[PDB]
Design a protein around this ligand. Sequence first.
Ligand SMILES: [K+]
Ligand SMILES: [K+]
Ligand SMILES: [K+]
Ligand SMILES: [K+]
Ligand SMILES: [K+]
Ligand SMILES: [K+]
Ligand SMILES: [K+]
Ligand SMILES: [K+]
Ligand SMILES: [K+]
Ligand SMILES: [K+]
Ligand SMILES: [Mg+2]
Ligand SMILES: [Mg+2]
Ligand SMILES: [Mg+2]
Ligand SMILES: [Mg+2]
Ligand SMILES: [Mg+2]
Ligand SMILES: [Mg+2]
Ligand SMILES: [Mg+2]
Ligand SMILES: [Mg+2]
Ligand SMILES: [Mg+2]
Ligand SMILES: [Mg+2]
Ligand SMILES: [Mg+2]
Ligand SMILES: [Mg+2]
Ligand SMILES: [Mg+2]
Ligand SMILES: [Mg+2]
Ligand SMILES: [Mg+2]
Ligand SMILES: [Mg+2]
Ligand SMILES: [Mg+2]
Ligand SMILES: [Mg+2]
Ligand SMILES: [Mg+2]
Ligand SMILES: [Mg+2]
Ligand SMILES: [Mg+2]
Ligand SMILES: [Mg+2]
Lengths: 153, 84, 206, 127, 98, 115, 100
Amino acid sequence: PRRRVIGQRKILPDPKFGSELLAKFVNILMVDGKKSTAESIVYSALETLAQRSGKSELEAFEVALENVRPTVEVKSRRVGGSTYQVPVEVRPVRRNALAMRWIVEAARKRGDKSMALRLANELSDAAENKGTAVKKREDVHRMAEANKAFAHY
Amino acid sequence: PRSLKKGPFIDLHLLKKVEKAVESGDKKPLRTWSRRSTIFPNMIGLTIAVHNGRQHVPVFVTDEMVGHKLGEFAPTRTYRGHAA
Amino acid sequence: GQKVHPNGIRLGIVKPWNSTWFANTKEFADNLDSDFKVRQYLTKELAKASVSRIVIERPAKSIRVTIHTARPGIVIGKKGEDVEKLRKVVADIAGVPAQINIAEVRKPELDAKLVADSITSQLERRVMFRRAMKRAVQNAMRLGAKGIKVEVSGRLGGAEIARTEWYREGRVPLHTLRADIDYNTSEAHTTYGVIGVKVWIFKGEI
Amino acid sequence: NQYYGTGRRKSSAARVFIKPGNGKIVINQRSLEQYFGRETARMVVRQPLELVDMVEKLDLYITVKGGGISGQAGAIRHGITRALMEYDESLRSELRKAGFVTRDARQVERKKVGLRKARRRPQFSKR
Amino acid sequence: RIRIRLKAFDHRLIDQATAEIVETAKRTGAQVRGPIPLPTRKERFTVLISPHVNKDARDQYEIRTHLRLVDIVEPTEKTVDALMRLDLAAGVDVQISL
Amino acid sequence: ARIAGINIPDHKHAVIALTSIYGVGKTRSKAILAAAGIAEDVKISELSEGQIDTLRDEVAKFVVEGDLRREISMSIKRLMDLGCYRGLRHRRGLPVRGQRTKTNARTRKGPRKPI
Amino acid sequence: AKQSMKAREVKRVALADKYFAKRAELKAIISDVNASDEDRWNAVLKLQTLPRDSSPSRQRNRCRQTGRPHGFLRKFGLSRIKVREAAMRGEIPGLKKASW
RNA sequence: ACCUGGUCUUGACAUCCACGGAAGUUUUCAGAGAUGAGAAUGUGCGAACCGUGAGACAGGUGCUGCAUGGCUGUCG
RNA sequence: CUCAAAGGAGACUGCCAGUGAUAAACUGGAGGAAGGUGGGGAUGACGUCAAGUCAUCAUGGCCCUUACGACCAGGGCUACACACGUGCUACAAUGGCGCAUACAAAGAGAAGCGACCUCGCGAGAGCAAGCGGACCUCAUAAAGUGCGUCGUAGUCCGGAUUGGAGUCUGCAACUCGACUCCAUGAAGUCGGAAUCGCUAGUAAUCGUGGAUCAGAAUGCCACGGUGAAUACGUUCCCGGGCCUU
Ligand SMILES: [K+]
Ligand SMILES: [K+]
Ligand SMILES: [K+]
Ligand SMILES: [K+]
Ligand SMILES: [K+]
Ligand SMILES: [K+]
Ligand SMILES: [K+]
Ligand SMILES: [K+]
Ligand SMILES: [K+]
Ligand SMILES: [K+]
Ligand SMILES: [Mg+2]
Ligand SMILES: [Mg+2]
Ligand SMILES: [Mg+2]
Ligand SMILES: [Mg+2]
Ligand SMILES: [Mg+2]
Ligand SMILES: [Mg+2]
Ligand SMILES: [Mg+2]
Ligand SMILES: [Mg+2]
Ligand SMILES: [Mg+2]
Ligand SMILES: [Mg+2]
Ligand SMILES: [Mg+2]
Ligand SMILES: [Mg+2]
Ligand SMILES: [Mg+2]
Ligand SMILES: [Mg+2]
Ligand SMILES: [Mg+2]
Ligand SMILES: [Mg+2]
Ligand SMILES: [Mg+2]
Ligand SMILES: [Mg+2]
Ligand SMILES: [Mg+2]
Ligand SMILES: [Mg+2]
Ligand SMILES: [Mg+2]
Ligand SMILES: [Mg+2]
C-alpha cells in the first residue's frame, strides 16, 4: 500500500506438532476454507515421508524446504528508457513462502492417486533435488544469474 | 398436466357444439377459440376449426388426436428461417 | 448530488411522526389509506386557513385529528360551527367517531410549510420570484431563526430554460442530525408549468 | 467454591464453571473428546491450562450455545480464561501476554446493496 | 392470573404504559410480576428510490415493534375494574388475557 | 457376462455393470439384484452361471434394448406424422419442452452455424 | 395507471365477493375424494360458467394512491415510490431509515 | 400498455339534470365472450341504488425529459 | 448464569517516555473488552453530463374524441442462421455414492404457517392439533466428522436433451408453469487474444430466510458456518487532490 500501515497477523501452531511453520503450509494447501481437510492431507503425507526416511516429520520437512528455498530472484524495474529484470535478495520469510507454494503447486500437478500421496512424492524428491519445485528453484536462480550485471538498479 | 382426480378439461360451450353435431350429419366445420380443450373420444371425424390468434385453422380429428389439446394442432407463430 | 430528506433522516432523533397509531399487518394498509383521504380532504377544504401540519392519532376505534394552523378562527368559525362541519366529514371518511383539535402556529414566518405556501401563492399571482424569496428569508431571520434557505426551481418568470435559484442566511447545518430543521415543499401551477419551492428553517441544535 | 467465566466468540457464548479437581472436562453433558472432534478445537480449549500449569488440578463444567465448532471452542477458551482469573488474580499478566483475555470482536460483515456479499462486487465491464 | 401484553412502535411510549400499569395495580391490592421485555421485532423493507432504473440505488427502512409482559398474580376485585378504565395513550396496543 | 443380448463388464460391481443395458438405470439395476438375491458389491466375474441366468429372466420383465429403442422411436414417429406442435419441434430439431431459443438451445441445434 | 385500468380492479374485487361462497363449495366437490364421478363432472363444468373475473387469481395488487401494478408492498398497500414519499414525511408510524 | 377478430358511443371512470324505477336475490336460452332476450323473487329505509334520455364533458401507458416539478444516477 | 430490553458505564493521544519550532503532531509503552476515525452502516458540499424518468405521479404546450377513448375472446411480450453482457452447474479423488453422526444465525405466518397419524417409491393426499407466536408451525442447516466403496476412466465424473408415467396451484398449464418417478446420459478432461473481484472474519466455499407472489428464482435483499494468501514498495497503468509552469 501507499501508506505502509500493514503489521503482522498471528498464526496458530499446528495441533499435532505445534509448529507455526507447518501451520502455514496447511494454509497454503487449504482450499475453500476446508482446513481440517487440509490438515489430514498434510499429516498423512508427513507420515509417509517419516517412514520413507529416518528423520521425524519435521526434520524431513525442513530438509525438503532447504532444497526448494530460493535465495535470489528477479523483479522488474522500469527506469529512464526500458525495464530490466533486476536480481534482488529474497528476504528470509519470503524464502519459506515461495518454497511452500512451489511444493504445493508441483504436487497438485502430479498424476498419483490421492493428494496425500502426491504431496509425499514431492516432499521426498525435494529431499533428493528432483522433480518440479526444486526445478523451479533452479530456473529462478538461472534467471537471477543471467542478470547479475543489473545488480545496482 | 391436469391432475387425474379432476378428469380432462373441456370448455362447456364446445361440449355442446360437438353434441349438437355428432347426433346429426353436420359436417360443417366447427369454429372454436377453445385451444385449451382436451380432445375426447367422441368427435373423431368432423373438422374443428381452431383459432391460432388471427384465424381458425381446420383440424380433422382422428383417433390418435385423443388426449391432446386442440391448440397442439394450431401453431401460433409464423417462422420460415432467417435469410432463407 | 441528491440529498436525504431532512425530515425523514431525523424522524426518531429530534423530529416527531405525523401519524402516531399502532396496527398489525391486517389493518396497517387500511389505516394508511384513510389517513391519506383525511389529509386529502382537510388540505383542500382548509386551503385558506394556513394549515401547517395535520397530525392523526387512533386511540381505540376512534380517530383524533390535530390541525396546526395560524388562522384558527377561520378553521373554527362562529361558535365552533365550521370545526363541527369537518368533524362529520372526517368520521364519514375514517369510519370511526371523529374528534378535531386545533393547535396554534404562532409566528407563521418560522414554519417551513407556511413559508413555502406563501411563496407559492405569490408566484401564482405573477409576483417577481426574486422578491418573494428575499421577503421570506428576511422575515424569518428577523423573527429569530438561526438560519433559513429557500430554493425555487422551474421556468422562473416564464423563461424558456428552467433553472434553480436559492438564498440562505445564518446556519443551515443539514449534516448535523440533532439540528432542529423544519423542512417542507410546495408547488405553483403557473401558466408556464410547475415551479417547485423548498424551504429549510434552522432553529437551533437540541 | 465454584468459579465462573463467560466466554464469547462469533455468535457463540460459553458458560464455564471451574473448581478444584483432577482434570475432567464436560461440555454440554459430553466429554471434551466426544464434543470436539476437530483437533484444533481441542487444543484451543486446553490452551489456557497448558499455559498456567493447572491442567489436572481443576474440573471443568461447561455449557455452550450458538455458532459452530471453532466459535464454541474459542468461546470456551475465553470464558475459561475469565474463570481462572476469578480463581487467582495473579494470572492476568501471563494470560494477557498470550492474547487469551481479549474478546475477539471479529464478526460477519453484513451484506450490502449492490454487492454480491460484504465486499465482492459484481463483475465489471467497460463496454 | 391475568396476562398483559403491550405493543408499540416507540419504546418510550411503551414504558409509560408499563410504569402506570404496574402502579395502578400494586395500589389496588394485587401484586405484579415484571414487566418483562420480550424480544423486539424488527421488520425491514428495501425499496428502489429512482422512478426509473438505477437498480443499485435503494433505501432501507425498518419498523421496530417493542413488546412488554405484565403478570398480575392474585387479582383483587378492585384491581380488575381499575384496569379497563385506565385509558392508555394512543399507539399502545393492549391485549388482556385471563 | 452376456445379458439382454449385450456383454456386460466383468470387473465392475453387479449393480454398476447392469447399467450397461439400455433401459436399466441405477434404480432398476438395484431392483433386479434384489429380485435375484445377489449382493450389489459382488463383481459379475465371480458370479456362477447358475446366477447369471437368474438375472436374465428378471431383465426379460423389462422392455430393454431394441424393443425399448423401437418404442422410443415409435413414440417420436407418432408425434411427427401427427402434425402436433411437439412433432413440429422434432421435425425442425428445436427444443420441444418450451425452452428459450433466442440464446442457448445448443444441445438441440448443435454447434454454431455462422451466417 | 389509466382510469379504465383502475376500474377493472374494483369490478374484479366486487365479483370475487359476490361469488365467493358459490365458488368454494364447487371446489369442495371437485376436490372431494369420495364424491361421485358425474357430479364432479358437473361441478367442473359449472365452475367454468361463473365469470372469470370472480376468481381471486385474476386480481393484481395496485398502489392504492397511484394504481401502479409493479413494486407493490402489502404492508402499506402502496408502490415503492409512494411508500418512500410518505415515510420521509413521517406519515407511516414507526417507519424510519434503517441501519445495522 | 401490443396483434387479429368480435363490439360501444355523455361512455368502463366523475359532476350536473330529466324520467323510470328500492337495491338486491333466483333461474332459461343465443353467443368464444362482451352482450342481448328474457323469466322468477323481493320492494324495504326522499336518498341510498339501478335503468334510460339529452350536453356541458369525461377518457388517452398519445407527442415533447430539448418547455417542467418531484425523484435518481454520476464525477465522489 | 446464558439470554431478552430498558437505563447507565467505557477511549479522551487521557496516562508515560522519546521526538519536534517551548507548537501542532508523530513513534513507542502501560492499563484495558476495545487504542489512536476500534469494526460496519446511515450521512453525498458548490456544481457537472440540455445524463435518466411526460409509462409511478404531477404538469406548460401540442394532438385524438362513434376514437389514439371503452368492453371482450384468442394470440403475442416465451419467436431464432446469429452477436454481446450478467449468472448457475461442471469437467472430478481436497472427489462421487452409501450408512452413521455433530455444531448456526436471521426471519415469516390468519383466504396464513400447518405438526401428529395413516396412505403413496416420490412430488403429494386424507385426517387433524397448536399458533396472530421467546410458547405453535415453517424447520433436518449444509459444509464437517466416522465407516465402507469407487481407483483416474468421458468413469459410480458431469446432468444437458428426449420418451413414458404422475403430482400441485389455478375457471384454465397446447402455445407457455413448478415439482416427482422410471428410462435416456449431450457438451465438457480447466478454457485464444483479452478481462473482473477482493487487504480479514475479507476472498473462497457451505447451507438458511425474506420481499414480490394462487402457482412460478440460478435474480434481488438479508443470515449465519468454515476460513485463507499477500502487500518489499510507488518507477509504470487508471482515476483524483494541492502548488507551480
Ligand atoms: K428532471
Ligand atoms: K405533458
Ligand atoms: K398470452
Ligand atoms: K420458448
Ligand atoms: K442465473
Ligand atoms: K455417468
Ligand atoms: K403454461
Ligand atoms: K472461463
Ligand atoms: K411464491
Ligand atoms: K498543470
Ligand atoms: Mg458469508
Ligand atoms: Mg416473529
Ligand atoms: Mg435417474
Ligand atoms: Mg419458460
Ligand atoms: Mg391518469
Ligand atoms: Mg397475479
Ligand atoms: Mg378493433
Ligand atoms: Mg434531462
Ligand atoms: Mg499500546
Ligand atoms: Mg445517496
Ligand atoms: Mg437528454
Ligand atoms: Mg431517452
Ligand atoms: Mg414514452
Ligand atoms: Mg385479454
Ligand atoms: Mg421479456
Ligand atoms: Mg453422479
Ligand atoms: Mg412466504
Ligand atoms: Mg468430447
Ligand atoms: Mg477425467
Ligand atoms: Mg480498501
Ligand atoms: Mg448461496
Ligand atoms: Mg488537500
